Swiss-Prot record, chain A:
Organism: Escherichia coli (strain K12)
Pfam families referenced in this protein's UniProt entry, alphabetically: PRK (PF00485)
GO BP: coenzyme A biosynthetic process
Protein name: Pantothenate kinase
Keyword ATP-binding carried by entry: yes
Major enzyme class: transferase
Swiss-Prot record, chain B:
Key word ATP-binding present: yes
CDD domains attached to this UniProt entry: PanK
Molecular-function annotations in GO: ATP binding; pantetheine kinase activity; pantothenate kinase activity; protein homodimerization activity
EC number per UniProt: 2.7.1.33
Locations listed in the record: Cytoplasm
Keyword vocabulary terms for this entry: ATP-binding, Coenzyme A biosynthesis, Cytoplasm, Kinase, Nucleotide-binding, Transferase
Organism for this UniProt entry: Escherichia coli (strain K12)
Sites where the protein binds ATP: G88, S89, V90, A91, V92, G93, K94, S95
The keyword ATP-binding appears for this protein: yes
The protein, known as: Pantothenate kinase
Pfam families: PRK
Gene Ontology cellular component terms for the protein in this record: cytoplasm
Cystines in this chain: none
Family: Belongs to the prokaryotic pantothenate kinase family.
């Protein structure tokens, strides 16, 4: 078998096989916290995939702390609680949120940190008002719909030792950044950053370039992959269910999508996909996959089929 | 005001080296003197010795990691090298720094084997540059074939056994036709060059979406104030004149006839009109992408050291 990439390859079996000295199981409580998270997520999927994943990440995080100690000694450094940041990328409705939320659950179970914050990139979009002014609100999720000078600043601050760093928050009810709903990140041990753009660089923002990227401040990055045809279906389904804020909202900017019949809805969904989002993926997201530390490849039902980890 | 870098002035740095009294054999002292000779042993002991001590903590910490994971996943084999990249402007001391660290880093039993590849060999051959009218622009994103360079480190971090790299000659001042070097699974590979910290963002004419930085474990940027960089650049030109003194058919043969005052006038024009711009827009902007920053004074003496938090 001849290939050889910068990645170690594992098919489902090989992954769900990895056992570590001292058995991996999940207590009652954990088992609960997760069904509330997605409930479409099977416990077997969690045990076979994410449990071992979290185990993997812990080795990485732990090795880091060990290093912190050695160095803190060598150069004599007071304190400064610099959190370990793990980012999660991928296309729309790929499971970015779910994965993040799940890892945050499991990762807390380690006495080495146990403290894990989670910030989703959506909060860093330009408020609908600004988007309307730039004629971008059918383009939410494109490099121009993001204020990532602010985002890079966020993780930059976190990695700078700034104690309490605040972050904007996006609402899935009114689908707009919450006016005065910014969240305060109080020195966490681990910060998980979920979003479509966590892997992008200034090369993706020529209209307003930046020279130090989000990745420059992220310790470990995870990209959630899936074949195009699948991404299409998942996108469509999200639309079907959310109609892009069409619902929850007096008469959302896209209130008109409410009246759409199923046939019309999916008809619309894939015009939006084929003409907008499919290109966002193809040219702004997909190209960053190889920039990830670990790549998860899913099957039609979100089951993880492959796992690639940088050598 | 806080930042992503820890700061140390010459004093503080030359201070954490007392930890584990570190000396060095007489032959290595010979070695180094041969490398630069303008490099004082004092500077080596005060700066680069503890620098290498630092890198070792990072590298060894990593090997322990490897073991741990190697177990958990039962991967085995594969000799993935630890890559350190060194960036900076022209005549800033990239080569020297790289060659020096290569010396010191090998004295650790965990490593001991450290290759050194310099970015220059990845420039397009003069023939090609001439075709694109870029050979007064050697060092600019377009004078580089970095799809090749990116592939080089990608290959290395892919586990590919023997990976070759093109080599640049400082005699002919061109990439040597059949002079490619083979990198035979070393422990540490040091990549010295001007562009080691750039991204596709600097290559719009032919972008790439996975950067050299994505395959480098530790990056060092050598900094110095503009006025100094100019001096150093000019001094280099005065000394070498783009190989007009070693290649009778050098493309810049005419630089030979220049008298010192003419040479300096020339260099300062090249800098002010070309290289000053390369630095200002393709090189300096990448400084903050470095893991560690070295700041030198008029005499290449390192006055400050910043390491990412
Ligand atoms: N591991 C998983 N198992 C089963 N279903 C999943 C899984 N991950 C995601 N899903 C399904 O996919 C839908 C979207 O998951 P979600 O985590 O919200 O994705 P996302 O990428 O964060 N979405 P978005 O930010 O809106 O582009 C859920 O409602 C689930 O039905
Ligand atoms: N630590 C140092 N101490 C003393 N002199 C130094 C030092 N580093 C560099 N130099 C001087 O600077 C000159 C150039 O050093 P060098 O390491 O070749 O720089 P460089 O960045 O690799 N040059 P180039 O690749 O041609 O842009 C040497 O000839 C020395 O005179
Ligand atoms: Mg989400
Ligand atoms: Mg050199």
């Amino acid at each position: 078998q001849t290939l050889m990439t910068p990645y170690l390859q594992f098919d489902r079996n090989q992954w769900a096989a990895l056992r570590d000295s001292v058995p991996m199981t999940l207590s009652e409580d954990e088992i609960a916290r997760l069904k509330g998270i997605n409930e479409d997520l099977s416990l077997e999927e969690v045990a076979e995939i994410y449990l071992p994943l979290s185990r993997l990440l812990n080795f990485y995080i732990s090795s880091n702390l060990r290093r912190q100690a050695v160095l803190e000694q060598f150069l004599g450094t007071n304190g400064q609680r610099i959190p370990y940041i793990i980012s999660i990328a991928g296309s729309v409705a790929v499971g970015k949120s779910t994965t993040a939320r799940v890892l945050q659950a499991l990762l807390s179970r380690w006495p080495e940190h146990r403290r894990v914050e989670l910030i989703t990139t959506d909060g860093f979009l330009h408020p609908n008002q600004v988007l309307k002014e730039r004629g971008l609100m059918k383009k939410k999720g494109f490099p121009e719909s993001y204020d990532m000078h602010r985002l890079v600043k966020f993780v930059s601050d976190l990695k700078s030792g700034v104690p309490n760093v605040t972050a904007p928050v996006y609402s899935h009810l009114i689908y707009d950044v919450i006016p005065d709903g910014d969240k305060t990140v109080v020195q966490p041990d681990i910060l998980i950053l979920e979003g479509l753009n966590v892997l992008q660089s200034g090369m993706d923002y020529p209209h307003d370039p930046h020279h130090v990227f989000v990745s420059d401040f992220v310790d470990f990055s995870i990209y959630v992959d899936a074949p195009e045809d699948l991404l299409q279906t998942w996108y469509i389904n999200r639309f079907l269910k959310f109609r892009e804020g069409a619902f929850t909202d007096p008469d959302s900017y896209f209130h008109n999508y409410a009246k759409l019949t199923k046939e019309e809805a999916i008809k619309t969904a894939m015009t939006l996909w084929k003409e907008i989002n499919w290109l966002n993926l193809k040219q702004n997201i997909l190209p960053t996959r190889e920039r990830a530390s670990l790549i998860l490849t899913k099957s039609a039902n979100h089951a993880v089929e492959e796992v690639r980890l940088r050598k």
